[PDB]
Amino acid sequence: MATFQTDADFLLVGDDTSRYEEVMKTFDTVEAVRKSDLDDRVYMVCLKQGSTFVLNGGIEELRLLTGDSTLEIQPMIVPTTE
């Protein structure tokens, strides 16, 4: 009962694993990934325009993929120009 759906890019926090790409790749909704210069333990996933990253099992199912319970998902905030 911890489903998670998002129709836009989001941030992921784990333990800095190279499998972060494969874990996200599992979701067709994922278009690309980028590491955070400020925080190495933070990654921003960019979904494909038109797709929707839905979690039928929630964040728990996602943690099983990479094999880390620390794996979390947060709403990526868009920066402002001037």
Other C-beta atoms lying within 10 Å of the C-beta of residue 21: 13
Please return the burial class of 24, using the count of CB atoms within 10 Å of its CB with bins 0-12, 13-18 and 19+.
buried
Answer whether 33's CB lies under 8 Å from 21's CB.
yes
Experimental method: NMR
Q: So what CATH class is 1-82?
A: alpha beta
CA distance 26 to 32: 12
Answer whether 11's CB lies under 8 Å from 74's CB.
yes
